Amino acid sequence: STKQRAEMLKQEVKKMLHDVSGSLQELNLINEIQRLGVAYHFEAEISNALERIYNREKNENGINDCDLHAVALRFRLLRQHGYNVSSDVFKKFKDENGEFEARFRNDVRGLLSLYEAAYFGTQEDGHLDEAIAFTTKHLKSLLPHLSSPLSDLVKLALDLPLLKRIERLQSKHFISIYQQDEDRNNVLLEFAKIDFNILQALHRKELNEITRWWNESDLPRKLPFIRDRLVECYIWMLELYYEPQYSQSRRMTTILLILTSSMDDIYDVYGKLEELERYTVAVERWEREALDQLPDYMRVHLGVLLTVVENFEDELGKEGKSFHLAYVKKAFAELTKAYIKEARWANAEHVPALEEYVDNAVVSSAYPLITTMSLLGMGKVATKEAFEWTISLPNAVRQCSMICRLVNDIMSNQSEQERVHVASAVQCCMKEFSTTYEEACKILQEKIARAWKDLNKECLHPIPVSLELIRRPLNLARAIEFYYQIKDYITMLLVEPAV
Numbered sequence: 262s263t264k265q266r267a268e269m270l271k272q273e274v275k276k277m278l279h280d281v282s283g284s285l286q287e288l289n290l291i292n293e294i295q296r297l298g299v300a301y302h303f304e305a306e307i308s309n310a311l312e313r314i315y316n317r318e319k320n321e322n323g324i325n326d327c328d329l330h331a332v333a334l335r336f337r338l339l340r341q342h343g344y345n346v347s348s349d350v351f352k353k354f355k356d357e358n359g360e361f362e363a364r365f366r367n368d369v370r371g372l373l374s375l376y377e378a379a380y381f382g383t384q385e386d387g388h389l390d391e392a393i394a395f396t397t398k399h400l401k402s403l404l405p406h407l408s409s410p411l412s413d414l415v416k417l418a419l420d421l422p423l424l425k426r427i428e429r430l431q432s433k434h435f436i437s438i439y440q441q442d443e444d445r446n447n448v449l450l451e452f453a454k455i456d457f458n459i460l461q462a463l464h465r466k467e468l469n470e471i472t473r474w475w476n477e478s479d480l481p482r483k484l485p486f487i488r489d490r491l492v493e494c495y496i497w498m499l500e501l502y503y504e505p506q507y508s509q510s511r512r513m514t515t516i517l518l519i520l521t522s523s524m525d526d527i528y529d530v531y532g533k534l535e536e537l538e539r540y541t542v543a544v545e546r547w548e549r550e551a552l553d554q555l556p557d558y559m560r561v562h563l564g565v566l567l568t569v570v571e572n573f574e575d576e577l578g579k580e581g582k583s584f585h586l587a588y589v590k591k592a593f594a595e596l597t598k599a600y601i602k603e604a605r606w607a608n609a610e611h612v613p614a615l616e617e618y619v620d621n622a623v624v625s626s627a628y629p630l631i632t633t634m635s636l637l638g639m640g641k642v643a644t645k646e647a648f649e650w651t652i653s654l655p656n657a658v659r660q661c662s663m664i665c666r667l668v669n670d671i672m673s674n675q676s677e678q679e680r681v682h683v684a685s686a687v688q689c690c691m692k693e694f695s696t697t698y699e700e701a702c703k704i705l706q707e708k709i710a711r712a713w714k715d716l717n718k719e720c721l722h723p724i725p726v727s728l729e730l731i732r733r734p735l736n737l738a739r740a741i742e743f744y745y746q747i748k749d750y751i752t753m754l755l756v757e758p759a760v
């Protein structure tokens with residue numbers, strides 16, 4: 262059947278990767294495996310290969326290579342795994358003063374590799390800032406008169422690099438483009454085609470159960486004003502992590518992201534502040550007895566929240582790890598502590614200071630709750646230390662919420678401001694000094710780049726936790742970039758399979 266064919270292809274690819282252990286073919290094969298959405302099948306072998314590459318790196322046993330593609334791909338592959346390889350290997354190509362050599366203008370492959378490698382630099386990284394402008398200029402110059410199978414890659418990359426691109430949609434696009442390339446591998450492409458079909462089948466199957474749970478719930482029939490966002494809540498928990506072993510982790514969190522959104526609306530689109538200051542204490546206490554005095558719709562919403570939380574506790578109690586949900590309840594404690602502040606600013610007719618507003622909005626984005634609540638379905642990574650680290654609000658969690666808040670704000674500050682809503686970041690920054698809407702938008706756009714550069718730094722080897730746990734903030738930051746660029750996502754990532 263398909264599974265035996267997939268296993269045979271997996272062993273074939275393992276044998277080839279072993280046989281190319283010393284050449285650039287290893288780098289190309291690892292890159293193609295990662296970009297085809299099958300990188301998780303070869304975690305151990307890829308880790309060993311990258312360890313060997315790092316050991317023979319740093320000019321200790323490294324042969325000088327003039328190929329921009331080879332060194333750029335090596336740097337990008339090593340930086341994606343954690344190794345702190347210095348961004349100084351690009352000094353060789355900066356021969357003509359501080360500008361890159363002109364002989365690379367016509368090298369579209371090396372230019373694109375440098376383009377994708379440059380975005381992975383950190384704040385302290387050098388030689389990875391003017392490269393973006395260089396490659397942008399030359400790729401735009403050479404785009405109109407370029408051949409189709411590589412102009413497709415150029416057009417796919419100019420919109421967003423691999424750093425800011427969700428992995429599943431980019432994997433689909435690369436599988437679609439890789440057919441036209443004449444230097445491809447047939448077995449790797451077939452393996453990716455089979456794996457994509459199986460993972461898409463699993464992803465489509467889970468949505469059926471989630472929709473069944475929503476239908477059986479009391480949420481949709483009553484409380485009419487809630488806007489149904491079940492699909493756009495699964496796709497946000499589909500690009501965070503899509504591996505099959507995390508399937509149990511995608512049911513439990515998506516069920517609790519519709520509840521955390523319904524709550525946002527309950528606090529801003531409507532409701533009076535007197536009535537909202539009694540919801541916060543009810544959430545903090547976390548008992549059904551606190552629901553007696555609440556209004557009907559808040560009572561129903563928080564009762565459903567309590568029911569789903571206790572149901573999830575019952576499920577994690579089989580393996581003796583129910584106490585993890587003793588950390589989720591605390592997280593929901595802070596979120597309502599942030600929603601209840603902004604509403605007050607709505608009623609007091611006050612414009613918060615930018616720093617205070619940003620500090621409050623980092624918790625009112627629910628990216629801090631979504632980083633704690635994603636550990637529910639992790640088998641061995643979910644430990645007490647991991648949950649304590651996640652609750653302690655590390656810098657990695659903070660820098661993935663900056664992008665959310667600041668991008669949303671810029672996009673959705675016109676629909677709500679007409680009605681009674683909390684002042685957004687652009688209005689807060691226009692409050693001090695004197696700036697226009699566009700000049701404040703550019704200021705708020707100059708912060709997303711620094712947030713991305715700060716998020717790139719946290720995923721290195723000086724890490725308190727594992728790589729699987731730290732990968733989540735990066736994917737959370739990538740999902741706001743896909744939205745603010747969606748029936749195409751549903752129709753050709755979940756409905757239309759790959760031939």
Ligand SMILES: CC(C)=CCC/C(C)=C/CC/C(C)=C/CSP(=O)(O)OP(=O)(O)O
Pocket residue numbers: 490493494497518521522525529625626627628665669670673
């Ligand atoms: C599918 C989707 C968009 C969200 C589900 C997951 C969440 C909660 C993501 C982060 C928060 C965002 C971007 C809310 C947009 S609605 P808003 O701008 O009205 O929220 P606000 O009141 O401004 O915080």
Ligand SMILES: [Mg+2]
Pocket residue numbers: 525526529530
């Ligand atoms: Mg709102």
Ligand SMILES: [Mg+2]
Pocket residue numbers: 669670673674677685
């Ligand atoms: Mg807003």
